[PDB]
Amino acid sequence: TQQQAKANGISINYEDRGPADGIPILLVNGYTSTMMSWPLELMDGLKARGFRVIRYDNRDVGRTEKFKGVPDIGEVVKALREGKTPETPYTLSDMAADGIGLMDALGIERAHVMGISMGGMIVQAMAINHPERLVSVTSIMSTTGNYDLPKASDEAMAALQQQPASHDREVVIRHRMKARRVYQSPAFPRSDEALYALCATEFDHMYYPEGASRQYAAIVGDGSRVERLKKVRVPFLVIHGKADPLVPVEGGIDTAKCVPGAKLELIEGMGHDLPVELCPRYVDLIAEHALAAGRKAA
Numbered sequence: 655t656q657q658q659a660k661a662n663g664i665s666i667n668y669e670d671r672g673p674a675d676g677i678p679i680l681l682v683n684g685y686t687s688t689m690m691s692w693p694l695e696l697m698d699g700l701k702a703r704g705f706r707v708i709r710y711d712n713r714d715v716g717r718t719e720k721f722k723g724v725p726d727i728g729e730v731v732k733a734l735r736e737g738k739t740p741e742t743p744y745t746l747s748d749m750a751a752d753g754i755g756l757m758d759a760l761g762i763e764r765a766h767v768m769g770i771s772m773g774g775m776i777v778q779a780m781a782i783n784h785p786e787r788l789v790s791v792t793s794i795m796s797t798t799g800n801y802d803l804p805k806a807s808d809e810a811m812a813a814l815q816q817q818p819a820s821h822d823r824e825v826v827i828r829h830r831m832k833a834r835r836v837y838q839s840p841a842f843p844r845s846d847e848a849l850y851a852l853c854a855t856e857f858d859h860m861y862y863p864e865g866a867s868r869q870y871a872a873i874v875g876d877g878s879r880v881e882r883l884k885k886v887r888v889p890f891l892v893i894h895g896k897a898d899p900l901v902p903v904e905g906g907i908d909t910a911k912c913v914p915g916a917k918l919e920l921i922e923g924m925g926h927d928l929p930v931e932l933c934p935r936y937v938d939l940i941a942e943h944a945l946a947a948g949r950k951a952a
Contacts, residue, residue: 658717667710668689673701676704679706679708680757680765681707682767683715684771685814685866686869687771689711700940705766708757712749713748713749714862715865716859724867725871740871745876746779749872750776750780753777765789766947769792772869773794774909775876781888789888790943790947795894797908798883799879800880826857834849834927839923839925842929842930844929883912884912886912890909891919891939892910892917895925898926903920906918
């Protein structure tokens with residue numbers, strides 16, 4: 655089930671869910687999230703529509719290779735405001751090359767890709783840097799990095815950045831539950847038991863808080879993709895929750911405005927999560943987008 659492949663020079667833990675002749679779709683996780691965070695209803699729904707789902711741990715999370723260095727965000731932001739290219743252990747482009755490298759390791763020529771949050775930024779970078787490898791792109795609860803966009807609420811930013819008090823399992827899990835409630839979907843909240851199970855499964859997959867600073871530096875260091883995205887010609891779908899307090903909906907709207915011809919779906923009552931109740935709609939949106947894209951000229 656869980657296999658480890660050399661891709662883009664690093665060891666990537668992944669799962670190819672099959673079937674082998676299915677339409678390949680690579681799923682890219684958000685900041686600090688492991689491949690174990692995807693809802694079963696999303697993966698099963700995609701499989702029931704003929705999609706071969708490939709999920710994987712990004713660098714610095716889960717059971718994929720880990721890197722070194724503690725980047726200072728203030729130094730990165732200073733380089734950007736000076737108009738320079740910031741120095742970080744790795745970039746968003748490197749993380750995009752990881753996913754493309756996994757396609758190479760699986761013998762896949764072109765794939766559909768979908769990414770959530772930071773994963774949405776990664777699939778944007780895939781579209782900018784490797785368009786000849788992509789059939790379609792879906793960017794969910796993500797943003798362009800545009801500086802003029804409304805900021806996240808301070809409560810949501812605090813939920814994203816603050817570390818638990820200690821390494822104790824129940825301390826960490828309960829802390830992560832509390833953080834997820836801050837940016838959950840108001841119309842489709844999870845039960846405490848479901849939220850505990852999700853957070854526990856991720857914790858037990860791998861607890862690696864040291865990796866967060868390096869992923870965050872890659873996010874910040876990439877700046878704005880608005881100008882690059884205007885050159886993207888691969889079919890693009892943007893999904894965003896209207897009630898997202900962590901990545902305000904304007905960031906998804908901005909993504910759709912930049913990529914010419916992008917499709918935009920804004921979901922009422924949806925926050926910064928993938929409620930099981932909305933998974934049939936996500937599946938329908940992704941499947942029809944991918945099927946139509948697969949009929950178009952590359």
